[PDB]
Amino acid sequence: MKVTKVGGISHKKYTSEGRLVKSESEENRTDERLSALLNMRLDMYINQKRIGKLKKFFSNKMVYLKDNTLSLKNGFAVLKKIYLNENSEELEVFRNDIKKKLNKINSLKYSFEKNKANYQKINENNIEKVEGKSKRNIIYDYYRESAKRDAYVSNVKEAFDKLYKEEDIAKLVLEIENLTKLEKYKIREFYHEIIGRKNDKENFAKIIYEEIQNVNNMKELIEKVPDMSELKKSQVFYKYYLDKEELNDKNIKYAFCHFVEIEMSQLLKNYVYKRLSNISNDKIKRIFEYQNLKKLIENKLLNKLDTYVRNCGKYNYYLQDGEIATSDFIARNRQNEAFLRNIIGVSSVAYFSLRNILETENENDITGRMRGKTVKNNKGEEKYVSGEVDKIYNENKKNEVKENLKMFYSYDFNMDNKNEIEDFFANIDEAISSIRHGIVHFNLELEGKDIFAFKNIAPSEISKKMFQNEINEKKLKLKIFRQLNSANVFRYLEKYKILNYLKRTRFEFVNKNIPFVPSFTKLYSRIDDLKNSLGIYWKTPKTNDDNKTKEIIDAQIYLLKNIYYGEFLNYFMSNNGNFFEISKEIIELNKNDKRNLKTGFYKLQKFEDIQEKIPKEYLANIQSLYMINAGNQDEEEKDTYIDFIQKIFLKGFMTYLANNGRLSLIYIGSDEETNTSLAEKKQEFDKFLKKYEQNNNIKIPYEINEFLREIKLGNILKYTERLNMFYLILKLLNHKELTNLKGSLEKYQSANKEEAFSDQLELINLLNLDNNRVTEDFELEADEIGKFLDFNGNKVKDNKELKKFDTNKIYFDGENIIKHRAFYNIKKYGMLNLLEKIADKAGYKISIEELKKYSNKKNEIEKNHKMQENLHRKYARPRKDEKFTDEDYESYKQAIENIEEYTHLKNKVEFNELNLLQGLLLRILHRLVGYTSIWERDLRFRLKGEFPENQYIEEIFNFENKKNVKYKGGQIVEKYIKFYKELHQNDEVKINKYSSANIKVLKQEKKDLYIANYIAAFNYIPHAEISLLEVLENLRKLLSYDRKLKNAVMKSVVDILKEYGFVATFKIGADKKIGIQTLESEKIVHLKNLKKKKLMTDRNSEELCKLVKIMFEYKME
RNA sequence: GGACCACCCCAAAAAUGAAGGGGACUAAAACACAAAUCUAUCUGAACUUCU
């Protein structure tokens, strides 16, 4: 019986009591909802025809008691009178079950009132510490210090041994294995015999409640009532005497037999009672054996102790004198703390992209250095430091640094200046340290707009000139023009069809601060699916070429996309406009649909009670309902809150596209006699743009300038100085982190209800016209292609041998390079000599006969891909004969087997499997940074929670800093280890665990705490001297303080492997060590109906599937 | 040490059903103008409807 998450209501805890709260207003809804749940649904109260019809009848009928009346509500002998549609003497049968329903509601009503806000900053002897006020947090605050931690473990072991006696558990493990279904009560009623409730309710329940009223002291109650159970005496001390008695070492032991009994009950509710669950039967052996169970419960109370101490440190920076942490505070706090862990992550990628752009052989980072400034010696006071930008000019890498600078920036550098460039790398490195110090100074003052302030940083002569040549209104016109050309618009439209387009649609480049809008891709893809379900009148372009259709749709998307973000979202979100005209329409289109008029079970019924009076506030209510009902649906689904919100922005867009009034975008697209006249138009303009990247200010031809005269822009940033440094960070970022940085700045604005990065998000969108997808005229040294190719068993290195290698000239084709898109990302992040070593171990090479088979099968896919689409059409919509007999089935099987063995073979010689491998290795390493950033935030929280004094702890978590008294030099791990040694100076072996001889094994193997500097600096990527399965091993050792993070390491790695089409079965041995048992590429099922003949056509090739398993296991030497 | 196959919080006279609830409160995800294609689509309830 779910109580919350049903309207907009949710349990939100407050100062005086916890409260059921309708989404926005803080009024009490606890009495309103719990009176509404006080009803007996009459289908409970009961092959598939008589049963299935009666359940639909009595689900409408509810039996409630308002007020002490048995009247029924619309949605045995007394049950049939309702079925024959025909008072109080009859319905008194149900009060036996409604009194059990009433007592559940009164117990839940008291369950919400005690779930109140706990954490309160206090001020005892001039230090600001945070304590809990709840009954449990009084126990955790007693054992808060690290000295009393061993007494906390012993009291759990003492309480566990008084409740569970090694054969009561041993019989209880047997009953969990020896059930399948409907036998839960035998486990349950035996477990109540272990606790002993039958000699508790019947002997002490009514006795002890009288004596609580008299003696008002636990010491006097035990003297008054002797011979209590050790668990019952533990329960009374928790409820009636824990708030108001002082905690001695003798009376602290009463609270632990109740804390252990909760944990054993929570294990039964998850692994026995509810759903069993779907996990295993081998899991149960690991959980419930007595020596494992005694270890697991104390490994779970020590988790709950450490989350308290971590919360007392987290709520010490974020809270004033002065305040109690209500759920309004806590939820806003988490969305600001998740903001910080995304800016720590964006400065770890920006270091990493600055290490590839300036190739360091040491892979050792970065201060201080990257400009030449001398410093005084101990003797003589005369030296010159080793600046890495001056290490260019010793190795003469300036032909290669300028090559790496071109991939990130597209500015024409001149390495002969060499003082202008060393000032440019200073302004990149000072910009990353500026947002690094912003994380520190978002503690004393909660203003996130000042972490991108970039104060006291003057831009270079390059970075000023580079920014103004990417903002001014003439250059943005030649990026709109490049996006129009690259989307094949000039080839599939007439000249006046697009001049009429450019006179109307304006290009902004304004964030508009609207939450939860769908992207237009993922919304264009729904059109042909939803075309019949909604009154759309659209025609997706269909042509018999299927490479022409991909290029018309790529022009169909881009032309409608600038309508969607530019003109549409200003119309569709103004208070004048049709938002609720469409929102009430789609709820009616689902209600008045067929087969929902049969049974009124349409899914959009839970939206009809929402009005909200504003289209912008309506989304913030739907996006609030979405965030509270995430994680309920399994497999998961097309989720309702996103599916409903994609219908509004697609019905409303196609209504905005019909009314006023451009609708010639359908027939783009149609006149084949026109496309002959525009066939070479894309080639003439692309030849111009390659002459534009070689030199900008040449000349603009007349046919170019007729488009550029009409392209209109919304807003220009006008060059403030602090955006100049924020631009240099964003060019050092891939697309996945750049949208995470786009998302985290939007979620900061919607959480704090202010606009603070509206100048920053406007500059992210001026990088949204920069992704070119024909990337990026980089050089392709032909030796570097040929480390993956084997010409007669040897790597092709000579450029003449590459022409000798192939014949069909899908490679070299002199005198040029075919320049595949896969080698862009593998070289920008290179990670190019690494994937040589992985491919050499796995034998992944491009054979001659395997490349020769490519050009044979390439002239056969167009026969196979067309024949697959034709036979699939007989399967989906026959409409004529109700055929697709078995002779069509076997012909469809041989069609998709040939597409499968070609697409696996196309992706190998087009290097798309290396672009998938590089995309997979880097996606894992960008995710594991996000766990070491949680570790850095939760490291200062445990230390500030343990020690509210000792202000030197904050001096650990600084990054230059020149101010520190005790911990001067080093990064976080190098300064934490000397904090750890001077704290445990009397408690070896813990010093010798971090001793200077032990630390060399600890650092080289990247064990317990040196994996944090290893992951966050991306030190895997040049050499990989420790494998991923040992990085993931050492990260779970690092995150062992928090169990929800130690468990979510492997869950986030399996889910990354599942996005790239792999099903991973890891094994974790008896030693803490991870190995892959099996990888399989996930099966694309064809013909999902007909229930017997599926085809399973796996996505990634088996040769790539082996090659990923080597990548996790690859270690240097 | 065994992840994937979470975690935390509140509820013990009557109301021993702790056989219950809660969590944007806490992680994982999801949402976002990168990419990638061979999975009919569309309704629904804990396989079943559709033109």
PDB file of N, CA and C in Angstrom, chain A residues 978-1049:
ATOM      1  N   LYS A 978      50.175  12.491   6.146  1.00  0.00           N
ATOM      2  CA  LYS A 978      50.845  13.061   7.305  1.00  0.00           C
ATOM      3  C   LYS A 978      49.863  13.588   8.334  1.00  0.00           C
ATOM      4  N   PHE A 979      48.612  13.824   7.945  1.00  0.00           N
ATOM      5  CA  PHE A 979      47.565  14.012   8.941  1.00  0.00           C
ATOM      6  C   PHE A 979      47.268  12.708   9.660  1.00  0.00           C
ATOM      7  N   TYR A 980      47.309  11.596   8.932  1.00  0.00           N
ATOM      8  CA  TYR A 980      46.984  10.305   9.518  1.00  0.00           C
ATOM      9  C   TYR A 980      48.081   9.825  10.453  1.00  0.00           C
ATOM     10  N   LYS A 981      49.335  10.155  10.151  1.00  0.00           N
ATOM     11  CA  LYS A 981      50.437   9.709  10.992  1.00  0.00           C
ATOM     12  C   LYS A 981      50.552  10.522  12.273  1.00  0.00           C
ATOM     13  N   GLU A 982      50.324  11.832  12.215  1.00  0.00           N
ATOM     14  CA  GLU A 982      50.407  12.630  13.431  1.00  0.00           C
ATOM     15  C   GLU A 982      49.173  12.495  14.306  1.00  0.00           C
ATOM     16  N   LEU A 983      48.128  11.832  13.825  1.00  0.00           N
ATOM     17  CA  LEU A 983      46.965  11.525  14.638  1.00  0.00           C
ATOM     18  C   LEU A 983      47.093  10.176  15.320  1.00  0.00           C
ATOM     19  N   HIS A 984      47.781   9.231  14.688  1.00  0.00           N
ATOM     20  CA  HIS A 984      47.980   7.901  15.239  1.00  0.00           C
ATOM     21  C   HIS A 984      49.425   7.668  15.655  1.00  0.00           C
ATOM     22  N   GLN A 985      50.074   8.679  16.245  1.00  0.00           N
ATOM     23  CA  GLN A 985      51.494   8.588  16.574  1.00  0.00           C
ATOM     24  C   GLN A 985      51.773   7.596  17.696  1.00  0.00           C
ATOM     25  N   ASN A 986      50.760   7.239  18.477  1.00  0.00           N
ATOM     26  CA  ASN A 986      50.891   6.280  19.560  1.00  0.00           C
ATOM     27  C   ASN A 986      50.275   4.922  19.245  1.00  0.00           C
ATOM     28  N   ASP A 987      49.791   4.715  18.020  1.00  0.00           N
ATOM     29  CA  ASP A 987      48.989   3.546  17.682  1.00  0.00           C
ATOM     30  C   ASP A 987      49.476   2.844  16.416  1.00  0.00           C
ATOM     31  N   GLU A 988      50.769   2.527  16.350  1.00  0.00           N
ATOM     32  CA  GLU A 988      51.255   1.530  15.400  1.00  0.00           C
ATOM     33  C   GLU A 988      50.536   0.209  15.665  1.00  0.00           C
ATOM     34  N   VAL A 989      50.203  -0.562  14.620  1.00  0.00           N
ATOM     35  CA  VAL A 989      50.879  -0.719  13.324  1.00  0.00           C
ATOM     36  C   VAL A 989      50.419   0.294  12.240  1.00  0.00           C
ATOM     37  N   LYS A 990      49.444   1.142  12.592  1.00  0.00           N
ATOM     38  CA  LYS A 990      48.786   2.010  11.611  1.00  0.00           C
ATOM     39  C   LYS A 990      49.734   3.041  10.996  1.00  0.00           C
ATOM     40  N   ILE A 991      50.813   3.398  11.698  1.00  0.00           N
ATOM     41  CA  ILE A 991      51.856   4.202  11.064  1.00  0.00           C
ATOM     42  C   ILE A 991      52.620   3.363  10.052  1.00  0.00           C
ATOM     43  N   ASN A 992      52.940   2.120  10.421  1.00  0.00           N
ATOM     44  CA  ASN A 992      53.762   1.266   9.568  1.00  0.00           C
ATOM     45  C   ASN A 992      52.974   0.796   8.349  1.00  0.00           C
ATOM     46  N   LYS A 993      51.645   0.902   8.408  1.00  0.00           N
ATOM     47  CA  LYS A 993      50.823   0.647   7.233  1.00  0.00           C
ATOM     48  C   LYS A 993      51.013   1.745   6.188  1.00  0.00           C
ATOM     49  N   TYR A 994      51.374   2.953   6.626  1.00  0.00           N
ATOM     50  CA  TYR A 994      51.744   4.048   5.735  1.00  0.00           C
ATOM     51  C   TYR A 994      53.201   4.463   5.888  1.00  0.00           C
ATOM     52  N   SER A 995      54.075   3.544   6.291  1.00  0.00           N
ATOM     53  CA  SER A 995      55.480   3.879   6.466  1.00  0.00           C
ATOM     54  C   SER A 995      56.158   4.101   5.120  1.00  0.00           C
ATOM     55  N   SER A 996      57.326   4.748   5.168  1.00  0.00           N
ATOM     56  CA  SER A 996      58.013   5.178   3.955  1.00  0.00           C
ATOM     57  C   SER A 996      58.562   4.018   3.138  1.00  0.00           C
ATOM     58  N   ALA A 997      58.754   2.851   3.748  1.00  0.00           N
ATOM     59  CA  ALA A 997      59.102   1.672   2.967  1.00  0.00           C
ATOM     60  C   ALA A 997      57.853   0.988   2.432  1.00  0.00           C
ATOM     61  N   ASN A 998      56.756   1.054   3.187  1.00  0.00           N
ATOM     62  CA  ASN A 998      55.510   0.446   2.744  1.00  0.00           C
ATOM     63  C   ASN A 998      54.835   1.301   1.680  1.00  0.00           C
ATOM     64  N   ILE A 999      55.137   2.600   1.649  1.00  0.00           N
ATOM     65  CA  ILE A 999      54.450   3.510   0.740  1.00  0.00           C
ATOM     66  C   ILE A 999      54.934   3.347  -0.698  1.00  0.00           C
ATOM     67  N   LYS A1000      56.100   2.734  -0.917  1.00  0.00           N
ATOM     68  CA  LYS A1000      56.575   2.541  -2.281  1.00  0.00           C
ATOM     69  C   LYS A1000      55.845   1.394  -2.962  1.00  0.00           C
ATOM     70  N   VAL A1001      55.559   0.326  -2.216  1.00  0.00           N
ATOM     71  CA  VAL A1001      54.685  -0.728  -2.718  1.00  0.00           C
ATOM     72  C   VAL A1001      53.272  -0.188  -2.883  1.00  0.00           C
ATOM     73  N   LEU A1002      52.859   0.686  -1.967  1.00  0.00           N
ATOM     74  CA  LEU A1002      51.510   1.233  -1.974  1.00  0.00           C
ATOM     75  C   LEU A1002      51.301   2.197  -3.134  1.00  0.00           C
ATOM     76  N   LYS A1003      52.349   2.915  -3.542  1.00  0.00           N
ATOM     77  CA  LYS A1003      52.216   3.902  -4.607  1.00  0.00           C
ATOM     78  C   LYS A1003      52.363   3.271  -5.983  1.00  0.00           C
ATOM     79  N   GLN A1004      53.288   2.322  -6.130  1.00  0.00           N
ATOM     80  CA  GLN A1004      53.556   1.742  -7.441  1.00  0.00           C
ATOM     81  C   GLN A1004      52.431   0.814  -7.873  1.00  0.00           C
ATOM     82  N   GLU A1005      51.863   0.069  -6.934  1.00  0.00           N
ATOM     83  CA  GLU A1005      50.727  -0.794  -7.220  1.00  0.00           C
ATOM     84  C   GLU A1005      49.402  -0.053  -7.203  1.00  0.00           C
ATOM     85  N   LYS A1006      49.413   1.244  -6.874  1.00  0.00           N
ATOM     86  CA  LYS A1006      48.226   2.106  -6.813  1.00  0.00           C
ATOM     87  C   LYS A1006      47.160   1.532  -5.890  1.00  0.00           C
ATOM     88  N   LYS A1007      47.602   1.117  -4.711  1.00  0.00           N
ATOM     89  CA  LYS A1007      46.724   0.613  -3.669  1.00  0.00           C
ATOM     90  C   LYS A1007      46.118   1.764  -2.883  1.00  0.00           C
ATOM     91  N   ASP A1008      45.604   1.452  -1.692  1.00  0.00           N
ATOM     92  CA  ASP A1008      44.399   1.987  -1.057  1.00  0.00           C
ATOM     93  C   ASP A1008      44.046   3.435  -1.380  1.00  0.00           C
ATOM     94  N   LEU A1009      44.967   4.380  -1.206  1.00  0.00           N
ATOM     95  CA  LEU A1009      44.623   5.779  -1.432  1.00  0.00           C
ATOM     96  C   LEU A1009      45.321   6.426  -2.613  1.00  0.00           C
ATOM     97  N   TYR A1010      46.262   5.750  -3.253  1.00  0.00           N
ATOM     98  CA  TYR A1010      46.911   6.335  -4.415  1.00  0.00           C
ATOM     99  C   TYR A1010      46.196   6.007  -5.707  1.00  0.00           C
ATOM    100  N   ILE A1011      45.074   5.292  -5.631  1.00  0.00           N
ATOM    101  CA  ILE A1011      44.221   5.116  -6.789  1.00  0.00           C
ATOM    102  C   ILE A1011      43.407   6.374  -7.038  1.00  0.00           C
ATOM    103  N   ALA A1012      43.251   7.222  -6.021  1.00  0.00           N
ATOM    104  CA  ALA A1012      42.461   8.435  -6.183  1.00  0.00           C
ATOM    105  C   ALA A1012      43.197   9.467  -7.019  1.00  0.00           C
ATOM    106  N   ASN A1013      44.503   9.617  -6.807  1.00  0.00           N
ATOM    107  CA  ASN A1013      45.291  10.432  -7.720  1.00  0.00           C
ATOM    108  C   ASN A1013      45.502   9.745  -9.057  1.00  0.00           C
ATOM    109  N   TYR A1014      45.286   8.435  -9.133  1.00  0.00           N
ATOM    110  CA  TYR A1014      45.499   7.722 -10.381  1.00  0.00           C
ATOM    111  C   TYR A1014      44.297   7.844 -11.299  1.00  0.00           C
ATOM    112  N   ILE A1015      43.094   7.740 -10.746  1.00  0.00           N
ATOM    113  CA  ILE A1015      41.899   7.826 -11.571  1.00  0.00           C
ATOM    114  C   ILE A1015      41.611   9.266 -11.946  1.00  0.00           C
ATOM    115  N   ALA A1016      41.690  10.178 -10.978  1.00  0.00           N
ATOM    116  CA  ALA A1016      41.303  11.560 -11.216  1.00  0.00           C
ATOM    117  C   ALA A1016      42.276  12.305 -12.113  1.00  0.00           C
ATOM    118  N   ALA A1017      43.500  11.825 -12.258  1.00  0.00           N
ATOM    119  CA  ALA A1017      44.430  12.440 -13.186  1.00  0.00           C
ATOM    120  C   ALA A1017      44.456  11.745 -14.534  1.00  0.00           C
ATOM    121  N   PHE A1018      43.607  10.729 -14.729  1.00  0.00           N
ATOM    122  CA  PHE A1018      43.558   9.894 -15.933  1.00  0.00           C
ATOM    123  C   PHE A1018      44.918   9.298 -16.268  1.00  0.00           C
ATOM    124  N   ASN A1019      45.598   8.774 -15.257  1.00  0.00           N
ATOM    125  CA  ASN A1019      46.926   8.231 -15.493  1.00  0.00           C
ATOM    126  C   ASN A1019      46.904   6.829 -16.077  1.00  0.00           C
ATOM    127  N   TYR A1020      45.728   6.283 -16.372  1.00  0.00           N
ATOM    128  CA  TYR A1020      45.669   5.027 -17.101  1.00  0.00           C
ATOM    129  C   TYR A1020      46.103   5.208 -18.544  1.00  0.00           C
ATOM    130  N   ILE A1021      45.829   6.373 -19.129  1.00  0.00           N
ATOM    131  CA  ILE A1021      45.704   6.451 -20.590  1.00  0.00           C
ATOM    132  C   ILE A1021      47.009   6.346 -21.379  1.00  0.00           C
ATOM    133  N   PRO A1022      48.196   6.806 -20.917  1.00  0.00           N
ATOM    134  CA  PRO A1022      49.345   6.634 -21.822  1.00  0.00           C
ATOM    135  C   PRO A1022      49.966   5.252 -21.769  1.00  0.00           C
ATOM    136  N   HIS A1023      50.014   4.623 -20.597  1.00  0.00           N
ATOM    137  CA  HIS A1023      50.850   3.445 -20.409  1.00  0.00           C
ATOM    138  C   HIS A1023      50.069   2.253 -19.884  1.00  0.00           C
ATOM    139  N   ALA A1024      49.022   2.488 -19.088  1.00  0.00           N
ATOM    140  CA  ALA A1024      48.161   1.475 -18.483  1.00  0.00           C
ATOM    141  C   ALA A1024      48.946   0.466 -17.672  1.00  0.00           C
ATOM    142  N   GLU A1025      49.714   0.933 -16.698  1.00  0.00           N
ATOM    143  CA  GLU A1025      50.555   0.027 -15.936  1.00  0.00           C
ATOM    144  C   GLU A1025      49.811  -0.631 -14.789  1.00  0.00           C
ATOM    145  N   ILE A1026      48.503  -0.445 -14.721  1.00  0.00           N
ATOM    146  CA  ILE A1026      47.620  -1.267 -13.913  1.00  0.00           C
ATOM    147  C   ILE A1026      46.298  -1.382 -14.664  1.00  0.00           C
ATOM    148  N   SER A1027      45.771  -2.598 -14.748  1.00  0.00           N
ATOM    149  CA  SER A1027      44.632  -2.876 -15.608  1.00  0.00           C
ATOM    150  C   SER A1027      43.356  -2.296 -15.017  1.00  0.00           C
ATOM    151  N   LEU A1028      42.289  -2.289 -15.824  1.00  0.00           N
ATOM    152  CA  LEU A1028      41.009  -1.777 -15.345  1.00  0.00           C
ATOM    153  C   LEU A1028      40.439  -2.641 -14.236  1.00  0.00           C
ATOM    154  N   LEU A1029      40.496  -3.963 -14.385  1.00  0.00           N
ATOM    155  CA  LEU A1029      39.982  -4.854 -13.352  1.00  0.00           C
ATOM    156  C   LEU A1029      40.782  -4.805 -12.059  1.00  0.00           C
ATOM    157  N   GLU A1030      41.934  -4.149 -12.047  1.00  0.00           N
ATOM    158  CA  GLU A1030      42.636  -3.859 -10.815  1.00  0.00           C
ATOM    159  C   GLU A1030      42.459  -2.407 -10.390  1.00  0.00           C
ATOM    160  N   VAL A1031      42.090  -1.524 -11.319  1.00  0.00           N
ATOM    161  CA  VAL A1031      41.608  -0.198 -10.944  1.00  0.00           C
ATOM    162  C   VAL A1031      40.250  -0.303 -10.272  1.00  0.00           C
ATOM    163  N   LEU A1032      39.337  -1.065 -10.873  1.00  0.00           N
ATOM    164  CA  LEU A1032      38.024  -1.277 -10.275  1.00  0.00           C
ATOM    165  C   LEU A1032      38.116  -2.077  -8.984  1.00  0.00           C
ATOM    166  N   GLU A1033      39.141  -2.913  -8.848  1.00  0.00           N
ATOM    167  CA  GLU A1033      39.427  -3.574  -7.580  1.00  0.00           C
ATOM    168  C   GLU A1033      39.871  -2.579  -6.520  1.00  0.00           C
ATOM    169  N   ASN A1034      40.816  -1.707  -6.861  1.00  0.00           N
ATOM    170  CA  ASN A1034      41.350  -0.761  -5.894  1.00  0.00           C
ATOM    171  C   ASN A1034      40.413   0.399  -5.629  1.00  0.00           C
ATOM    172  N   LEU A1035      39.425   0.622  -6.487  1.00  0.00           N
ATOM    173  CA  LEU A1035      38.461   1.670  -6.208  1.00  0.00           C
ATOM    174  C   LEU A1035      37.393   1.195  -5.239  1.00  0.00           C
ATOM    175  N   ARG A1036      36.997  -0.074  -5.320  1.00  0.00           N
ATOM    176  CA  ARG A1036      36.100  -0.634  -4.319  1.00  0.00           C
ATOM    177  C   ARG A1036      36.772  -0.780  -2.965  1.00  0.00           C
ATOM    178  N   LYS A1037      38.097  -0.878  -2.933  1.00  0.00           N
ATOM    179  CA  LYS A1037      38.811  -0.828  -1.666  1.00  0.00           C
ATOM    180  C   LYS A1037      38.839   0.592  -1.121  1.00  0.00           C
ATOM    181  N   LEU A1038      38.926   1.579  -2.012  1.00  0.00           N
ATOM    182  CA  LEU A1038      38.910   2.976  -1.597  1.00  0.00           C
ATOM    183  C   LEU A1038      37.548   3.381  -1.063  1.00  0.00           C
ATOM    184  N   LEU A1039      36.481   2.950  -1.728  1.00  0.00           N
ATOM    185  CA  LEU A1039      35.123   3.325  -1.365  1.00  0.00           C
ATOM    186  C   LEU A1039      34.499   2.369  -0.371  1.00  0.00           C
ATOM    187  N   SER A1040      35.294   1.715   0.464  1.00  0.00           N
ATOM    188  CA  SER A1040      34.743   0.762   1.412  1.00  0.00           C
ATOM    189  C   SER A1040      34.105   1.424   2.620  1.00  0.00           C
ATOM    190  N   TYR A1041      34.241   2.742   2.770  1.00  0.00           N
ATOM    191  CA  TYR A1041      33.613   3.423   3.893  1.00  0.00           C
ATOM    192  C   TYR A1041      32.102   3.497   3.729  1.00  0.00           C
ATOM    193  N   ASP A1042      31.621   3.652   2.498  1.00  0.00           N
ATOM    194  CA  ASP A1042      30.202   3.813   2.218  1.00  0.00           C
ATOM    195  C   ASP A1042      29.759   2.630   1.380  1.00  0.00           C
ATOM    196  N   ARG A1043      28.767   1.899   1.867  1.00  0.00           N
ATOM    197  CA  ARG A1043      28.379   0.673   1.194  1.00  0.00           C
ATOM    198  C   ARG A1043      27.557   0.952  -0.053  1.00  0.00           C
ATOM    199  N   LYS A1044      26.832   2.068  -0.103  1.00  0.00           N
ATOM    200  CA  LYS A1044      26.051   2.343  -1.298  1.00  0.00           C
ATOM    201  C   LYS A1044      26.915   2.796  -2.455  1.00  0.00           C
ATOM    202  N   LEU A1045      28.146   3.217  -2.183  1.00  0.00           N
ATOM    203  CA  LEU A1045      29.099   3.593  -3.213  1.00  0.00           C
ATOM    204  C   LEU A1045      30.014   2.458  -3.602  1.00  0.00           C
ATOM    205  N   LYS A1046      30.350   1.580  -2.660  1.00  0.00           N
ATOM    206  CA  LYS A1046      31.134   0.401  -2.993  1.00  0.00           C
ATOM    207  C   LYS A1046      30.336  -0.536  -3.880  1.00  0.00           C
ATOM    208  N   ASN A1047      29.028  -0.598  -3.665  1.00  0.00           N
ATOM    209  CA  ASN A1047      28.194  -1.461  -4.480  1.00  0.00           C
ATOM    210  C   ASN A1047      27.872  -0.839  -5.826  1.00  0.00           C
ATOM    211  N   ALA A1048      27.857   0.484  -5.920  1.00  0.00           N
ATOM    212  CA  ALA A1048      27.490   1.150  -7.159  1.00  0.00           C
ATOM    213  C   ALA A1048      28.659   1.332  -8.105  1.00  0.00           C
ATOM    214  N   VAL A1049      29.830   0.802  -7.771  1.00  0.00           N
ATOM    215  CA  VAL A1049      30.948   0.847  -8.702  1.00  0.00           C
ATOM    216  C   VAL A1049      30.721  -0.134  -9.839  1.00  0.00           C
TER     217      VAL A1049
END
